[PDB]
Structures are given as structure tokens and as C-alpha cells.
Amino acid sequence: YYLKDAGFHIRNIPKAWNDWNLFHVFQNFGKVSYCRVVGDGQVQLGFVNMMSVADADEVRKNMNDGNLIGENFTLKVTDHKN
Amino acid sequence: YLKDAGFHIRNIPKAWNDWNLFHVFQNFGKVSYCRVVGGQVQLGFVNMMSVADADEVRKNMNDGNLIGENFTLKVTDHKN
Amino acid sequence: MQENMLKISGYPGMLNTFGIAQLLTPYRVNGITMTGAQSAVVALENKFQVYQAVQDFNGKKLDRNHKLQVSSLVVSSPAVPLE
Amino acid sequence: MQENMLKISGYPGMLNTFGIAQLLTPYRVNGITMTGAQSAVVALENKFQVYQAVQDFNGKKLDRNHKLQVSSLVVSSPAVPLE
């Protein structure tokens, strides 16, 4: 169904983003297999699967304590465990 | 046929089969196909898996000669 | 499905459908319809993979005799401007 | 033909037949029959490509969760001993 250790759960996505916005954050680190946003507050949930475990490990190397920090955003990224 | 990936072979020792020819060219890269056509020598044909593999064969030849300890193959590019 | 589809051409005429899929590694290929000796319509898993496959492979020189042309109708469409 | 067939297993369960062909790049794949979630029987173009694919891919680590097993009945059979 999915590739073990290549998936992420995302929190704290700015509410105005769509899936393309989330895609472009993760494409900076590797090839992206799938990407979705899941519309109370100013933030939404999301999911990203990288193309490979190596791609996902490149994301992991660029995180600051589980956070992907942009100029105007901080995504809280956790492994989809399996 | 992949353009620029194939070779005509002359001067193959007559005792060789296709496996003998294959192992000569496998030293330089991946081999797509290979065949011998059998008093002392026979002809053959080798297709490499890509142009880059065939170019690796070409980098290692002395004036169209592929030399071993006990053989000298005469190798030319097949052109269409 | 329109956003899953791309056009690819320029590869060697000898390729079969599996060979065309190998050209698109590592993207997930779900269907290939050959349309000429050197052209095919390809369905990938989703619009993100189509978008990335066009970026990776359009204009890619396979060897000195073959250059890929890859296109689709997929447009990157962020809701807020990229940083 | 027996000498064109190999067995491959251990790749991710998610793969379709196009994904299995991509594993075997650059060899020419002419047929794939999946035999389980992570196993298939594959026909390549000829015995030399089967031989090389077994060498290249048997024991190959795809990632920390997947290792390929690749086998066939193809035996290198030179008529005179190799140098």
C-alpha cells in the first residue's frame, strides 16, 4: 500500500495552503510520492509520502526537533510509523 | 537495434561459444546480446546494453583490436 | 485522470512498455499506451508525480541519438504564493 | 524459454508490474507474472541479461526494509576456460 519509513504526518500547516503549497516545501528535499492537506484554528493537518526512504531521510536531516521551519511557517512533522 | 551500441566481431577463436564472447565484453559493461557464427577463426556480433557501455568498449581498444592473452578480436562498429 | 497523464516521446523505437516504465524510474507508472514507434501516453500515480516527471525528463538526453520530450497538462497551483 | 526466466522477491509489497520492471533497469523485461505480494516470475530478453540481472540484483539492498532475492537456472557455460 505504502512504503515503510517514507511517510510523514504534518501538523501546524497554515490554513490557507493547499496541497501544492505543502508539496513545494517537501520537494526541496527529495522526490514526493503523495501529498494531501486536511482542512477551529489557523492551521490544518497534512500528509506527505516521499518517493523513497532515502528521500524521507533527507527530510529528516533538515528538521529542527521535528520541525520544518520556513520564513512564515513551522510545520510539525512526525514519522508515519509501521 | 540500439544505434551505436552494436559491434561486428572477426577473428574469434573457433573453439569459443557465445558465453566465451560474452565474458570478453562483459568486462567493459553490460551486454544486451551476443552471438558467434561458426578453419581457425569465426565471426560474431555483440550488442551492448547502452551506447555508454559500447563507448566503454571503444575506450579500451587498440585500433579496433580487442586483445587478450591468447586472442585478438577485430571489432568494428555496426552502422545502419 | 487528466492530471495523471503525460506524453513522452523520443526514446528508442525498440522499447516495449516495460522499457518505457524503466525510463520513468522512480515514479509510479500505472498504465502505458504506445502511440508510435517512439511515443506513448503514460498514466502515473498522481499529478505530483506527473509534475516531477516532466521536470526530470523533458529534454533529457538518453544518449547522443535520443532526447526525451515529456509534457502534461499539470500546472503547479499553490493557493498562496511560494516563499 | 527457461533460460529467459528469473525469480525475484523481497521488493516492497506496493509495487505493480511496472514497478518491478523499474527494479530491473536497464535490462529488457518482456513479461512479469506476480506470484505473491513480494515475488514475481520475470522474462528478460535472453540468458545473458538474466545472468547479469542475477549478478546485479541478488542480495541488493533497496532500503533498510527491503533486500532482493534473485535467482535463475542460467549458468555461464563457456566452451573453453576463461582467461
Author numbering:
A (entry chain B): 8 to 46, 50 to 92
B (entry chain A): 9 to 46, 51 to 92
C (entry chain D), D (entry chain C): 200 to 282
Which of the paper's sentences describe this entry?
Consistent with previous work, PICS-1(PID-3) and TOFU-6 interact with each other via RRM domains, which were previously identified as the RNA binding modules. Given that the two structures are almost identical, the native one was used for structural analysis. For one half of the interface, Phe217A is buried in a hydrophobic pocket composed of Phe217B, Ala220B, V228B, and I231B. Altogether, both hydrophobic and electrostatic interactions contribute to the dimerization and the other half of the dimerization interface could be obtained via the symmetry. TOFU-6C primarily interacts with PICS-1A through α1-β2 of TOFU-6C, and α2 and a C-terminal fragment of PICS-1A. α1 of TOFU-6C interacts with α2 of PICS-1A via both hydrophobic and electrostatic interactions. Specifically, Trp27, Phe30, His31, and Cys42 of TOFU-6C, make hydrophobic interactions with Lys246, Phe247, and Tyr250 of PICS-1A. Asp26 and Gln34 of TOFU-6C form salt bridges with Lys246 and Gln254 of PICS-1A, respectively. In addition, α1 of TOFU-6C also interacts with the PICS-1(PID-3) C-terminus via electrostatic interactions. TOFU-6C also contacts with the other protomer of PICS-1(PID-3) (PICS-1B). For cells with tofu-6 mutants, PICS-1(PID-3) failed to accumulate at the perinuclear granules in the germline, but a large fraction of the protein changed the localization from the cytoplasm to nucleoplasm in germline and embryos. Taken together, the localization of PICS-1(PID-3) in the cytosol depends on TOFU-6, and the TOFU-6/PICS-1 interaction is critical for both proteins to associate with perinuclear granules.
By using functional proteomics, we and another group independently identified a piRNA biogenesis and chromosome segregation (PICS) complex (also named as PETISCO) that plays important roles in 21U-RNA biogenesis, chromosome segregation and cell division. The PICS complex is composed of TOFU-6, PICS-1 (also names as PID-3), ERH-2 and two mutually exclusive factors, PID-1 and TOST-1. The PID-1 containing complex is functional in piRNA maturation and processes piRNA precursors at 5′ termini via its association with IFE-3, while the TOST-1 containing form is essential for chromosome segregation and cell division in embryos. Complemented by biochemical and mutagenesis experiments, our structural biology data support that PICS is an octamer composed of two copies of each subunit, and unveil the assembly interface within PICS complex.
